[PDB]
Design a protein around this nucleic acid. Sequence first.
RNA 1: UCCUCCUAAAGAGUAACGGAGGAGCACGAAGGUUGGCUAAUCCUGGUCGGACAUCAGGAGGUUAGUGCAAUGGCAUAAGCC
RNA 2: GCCUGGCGGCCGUAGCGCGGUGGUCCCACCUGACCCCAUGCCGAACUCAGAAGUGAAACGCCGUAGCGCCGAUGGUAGUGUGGGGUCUCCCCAUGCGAGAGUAGGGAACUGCCAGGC
Lengths: 116, 178, 50, 136, 94, 79
Amino acid sequence: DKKSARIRRATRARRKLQELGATRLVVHRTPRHIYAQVIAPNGSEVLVAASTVEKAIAEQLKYTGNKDAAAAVGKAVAERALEKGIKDVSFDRSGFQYHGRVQALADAAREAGLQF
Amino acid sequence: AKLHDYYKDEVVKKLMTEFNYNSVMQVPRVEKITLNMGVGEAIADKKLLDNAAADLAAISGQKPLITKARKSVAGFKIRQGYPIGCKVTLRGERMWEFFERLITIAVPRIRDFRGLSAKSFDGRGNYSMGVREQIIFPEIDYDKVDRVRGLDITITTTAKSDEEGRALLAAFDFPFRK
Amino acid sequence: GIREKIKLVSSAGTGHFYTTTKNKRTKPEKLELKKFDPVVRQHVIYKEAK
Amino acid sequence: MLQPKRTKFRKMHKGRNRGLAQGTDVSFGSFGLKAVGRGRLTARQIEAARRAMTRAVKRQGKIWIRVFPDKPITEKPLAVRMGKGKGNVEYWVALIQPGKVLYEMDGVPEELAREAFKLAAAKLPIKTTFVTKTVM
Amino acid sequence: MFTINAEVRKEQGKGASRRLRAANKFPAIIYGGKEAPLAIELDHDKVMNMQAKAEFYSEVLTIVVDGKEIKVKAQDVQRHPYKPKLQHIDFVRA
Amino acid sequence: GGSTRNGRDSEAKRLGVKRFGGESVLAGSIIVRQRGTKFHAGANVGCGRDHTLFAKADGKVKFEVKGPKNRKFISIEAE
RNA sequence: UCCUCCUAAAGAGUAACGGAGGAGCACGAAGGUUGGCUAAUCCUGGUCGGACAUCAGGAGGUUAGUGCAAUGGCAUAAGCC
RNA sequence: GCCUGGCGGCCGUAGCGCGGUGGUCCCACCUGACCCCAUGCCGAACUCAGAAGUGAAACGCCGUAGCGCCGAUGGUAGUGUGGGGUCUCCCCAUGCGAGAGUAGGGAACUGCCAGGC
């Protein structure tokens, strides 16, 4: 079961990321879209949103799930984080290996200043 | 390749006329064919398995790999995943590649038979055909017959009953009779 | 044990050495391994018996 | 058959009788035997009861036994000092309390079940009582 | 239909229950019907000789509780391992 | 025989009970395997390869209902 | 001498030639790690042929495994690669 | 307020088993893997390229309250503390009081965020 196999690939990482805390970045994949959110140290707020469901960018895509769209979302998370004064962020690979669309977003965001 | 193309058009795509479904996506599919070749009297050294798998790969399109044991086999010194045979399991296009070589060109060692039973059972509709040997394919020169080596075949499918798999049995040219 | 010990010398030219019980009775191919040398603080091969 | 099997231990604490029981009524049958007294009930005492009750129902119905021994009696060798470990087995025994049902019958008339369970009013370390399902 | 008289009890527990069963009554309850549970005392043998005839579990009973009528159903009964004249008894509202 | 030996001590120790600690360290138990009964969750930390929890904090112990994988855990007190 | 359960009293130690069983050596690998992976047992069916015996499908599940007896974690696997 | 999604809190009284309903926008299956990457062989998996079909499987929400689970009240089991007995559990006074069953409950909730309404 792939829903079950994903949490087997993710639990161990979450079980060390919980020892860092602070302002955190999470990613949501799916095959037809991609999303990310920045979550606050209190667990009660969301600080930055970006996706391929966002009407500004969805119209610019040849496919809403594509690797280039993941990099385009990454460059937007780092833009919004810079205007909101957000630094020293904790990254979660969100159950996916650090070479796919998850990396295409997070590396593009980090080269756009968002460390991680 | 023609037999997999026949499976894409002529097999089960009208089955709603005979079997009850809630979606046309429920019609049965072939998942795999596992295969088996037994090492026989060489089990206590079995360094020949690489050289036996290489000649199953002379009628199969797959790259050879060696079967690891399960639960050990007798007292022959078999421990954990000990290499003991060959499967070289077939999926996708490779299943029908083989079923366009089997008893089309690979023939000179077949037994007296004319048709396998259609009303056979297992509880899901997963059919089998007895062949015992790799039955040999003819070359421009051979010089290939000394022992030929074994072959076993049982298909695996998405079917839920023996009469649902009897409609999927249409996927081959092998002699089966109603 | 009947499996014996092997004493290997540092490839740093140090007099300090390494000793282990590595059995040959199923696996006879020679031990030739890297370890941390505590006299030069390097990661070096320990080789050749006695 | 009337003995613990597939166990990992062979000898048990001698024990006291404190259990209250929930085997207090006929479970599947229609007629039965109730303890209405207290003590130890042995494999030998239920053999004597089986031999007796069979004479009333010689060829009549199946008989069910609701009691089971969980404890062996161990006794020390005679020609040996105190200590040296727990003694050697003799007989199997169950602890009993007044509310417990010991036997059941069903495939017979109520006056033939009474003919067998009144015969059981003997050969036992308690003065048993004949019981039946009734309407309530 | 099996008219029995029920007085309400503000004692509870082992000491009170023993002191009750030692007299002409035993402990009982009435519950359900979107109303609180009610703890009562009932006749120690009248109820046993009634319920032994089994139609007590087939009909709605004409109980007199705290002087008044409500109608009830017999729900469950608690027996003692060797004392035949009951341990405790349950009723539900009708 | 005759039963033999029956070894000494079989030592096993229990510290994670009530408002334990409050000075510099709070503790679990020495029971050879421990991951959820007297363990840490969330941002709390204090256990390694030896399975004895010793978390380095001035927080007293606190008990609460459930946590990850429906295990019990133990928490810290603010003051 | 070391080591384990029950008996042994819901804090904690604990008797008995009480109920019952082991260790006295191994492992460069089963060690370090990033990633990937997931049984037993019962059942159905077997082949040129079986003193032993193939790989699937059906049931099932912290019932397999962990170098070694014994118990308990265990898939985040601490199980194997 | 609701539909879906992600997350934090919460972690199965969210489990077991049998249905309804819907994919608009979600979502999963599904489609392609001659060209990035990948398989002890295998496009199953990983990854890349996707919207032709399914609404079945799964998923979310809801229904069926039989089981697991919560749970009155009463009673029983057990006993803090005193006193007694033909007796090793049994009785009185006083404090406490299960577990399992019954009524009743239970088929996860909710805030932040973007999007469907």
